[PDB]
């Protein structure tokens, strides 16, 4: 029995909701309260009747705030996490520091009074868009603890991630003109660990902009994504292994089977 199975057996309805079984509280961290990022939302669930849960940061890219990814953090949170989406500390932040802002940003919910005894501080994972993305790449290089990763549209200078152990999903769009996929997305995926647990997941037809309004695709695969790895919800494998046939999707391809 998966000590960290939260929720009823999942569907692919299930997984589209903009809202899941878990309802949601918020809290907000000032930029005055945050050591190491320019502050951010809490959205966490507030049954602790079957246990904690993992943590997720998620950052926004390049002079961009919050807004951007706000609404990543209750579509996911309500599905069983605590999600904190940031500021940065300067909006002209480049990816790397953007990494060790997320990582400051999961460090400070170990001890935040409203949500340390909703998490489970031994799983955690990051996600970003674009510069973001970028960012959650390098946390992910910088800590192998991490349990997953999920750049959307990233960009970043660095194309060689051999340096991350962390199962990621790569969500790249179609076209993007900004983070090209050819460049950027899927030269992350290809010099990712042959071995890695990690997908690549490209959204038809898509702009760079894809993930800064609410995007049913790009949730429900990273809501299976953070379930299998982050809870390693073995439930959710079967909406990732084999590739997904949503028309939304131009590509795909995984180290499926995960197991
Ligand atoms: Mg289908």
Redesign the pocket.
Same mark, same amino acid.
């Given at each position: 029995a998966n000590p960290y199975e939260r929720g009823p057996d999942p569907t692919?309805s299930s997984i589209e909701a903009v809202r899941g079984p878990f309802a949601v509280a918020q809290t907000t961290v000032s930029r005055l309260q945050a050591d190491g990022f320019g502050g951010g939302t809490i959205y966490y669930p507030t049954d602790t009747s079957q246990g904690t849960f993992g943590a997720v940061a998620i950052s926004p890219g390049f002079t961009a705030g919050q807004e951007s990814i706000a609404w990543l953090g209750p579509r996911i949170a309500s599905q069983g996490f605590v999600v904190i989406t940031i500021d940065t500390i300067t909006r002209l932040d480049q990816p790397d520091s953007r990494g060790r802002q997320l990582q400051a940003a999961l460090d400070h919910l170990r001890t935040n009074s409203v949500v340390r005894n909703r998490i489970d501080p031994n799983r955690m994972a990051v996600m970003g868009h674009a510069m973001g993305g970028g960012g959650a790449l390098s946390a992910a290089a910088n800590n192998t603890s991490l349990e997953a990763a999920i750049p959307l549209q990233g960009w970043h200078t660095r194309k060689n991630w051999s340096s991350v152990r962390t199962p990621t999903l790569v969500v790249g769009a179609q076209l993007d003109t900004i983070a090209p996929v050819s460049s950027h997305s899927e030269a992350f995926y290809n010099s990712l660990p042959s071995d890695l647990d990690k997908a690549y997941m490209e959204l038809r037809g898509a702009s760079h902009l894809v993930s800064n309004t609410p995007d049913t695709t790009t949730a429900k695969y990273s809501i299976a994504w953070l379930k299998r790895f982050v809870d390693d919800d073995l439930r959710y494998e079967q909406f990732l292994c084999p590739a997904? %046939? %949503?028309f939304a999707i131009s590509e795909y391809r995984s180290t499926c089977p995960f197991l």
């Open positions: 692919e997904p %046939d %949503d």
